[PDB]
Symmetry: C3
């Protein structure tokens, strides 16, 4: 029903930014609420169609620790 | 009561970014929740006063299809 | 229980952007929903851990009036 899950680290298929899925909106694919670090590194709330997202393989990002921190935190909230 | 409507394509009166109104907050004008593509092209959730927004005339944006996609989708959700 | 309050002007401890706390998420410190102006000056919704935030001293920002406007408005909504 949903390709990506809440708390999963994802990347923008086009721009390649790192982010975390924080919510999903149903009703052909669903939209995703994802907190995503931009150019500067601001954890910015974005609204992205499922086709704009790709799974992030790595679980550790030393350059972007806050996104690892976010993913772990959300996976419990 | 509200100058702009949910699902309407708008532009930032100053910066000129393209966006879509996704929600409105009442109580002199109201604030708008609008998903708006920035420099890089991230559909970023912004919070803007009514005075910062202008109607977008065009209904078709080949350079920014996701904003057209967003507007149509929201106009049904 | 919470270091920063809703409606308080804050700065990103690292990047130094100006923003306003619009909501707080509990359950070791809490996360903050803060509307924050980026490079271009977009009032962007960001999600920040308490450790990423610092109190903003000044109450008047002539270069960024909308953040002063936001703070005052939210302190009543």
């Amino acid at each position: 029903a949903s390709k990506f899950g809440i708390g999963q680290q994802v990347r923008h298929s086009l721009l390649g930014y790192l982010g975390v899925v924080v919510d999903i909106d149903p009703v052909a694919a669903p939209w995703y609420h994802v907190v995503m670090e931009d150019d500067n590194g601001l954890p910015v709330h974005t609204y992205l169609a499922e086709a704009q997202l790709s799974s992030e393989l790595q679980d550790e990002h030393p350059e972007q620790p806050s996104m690892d921190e976010l993913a772990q935190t959300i996976r419990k909230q």
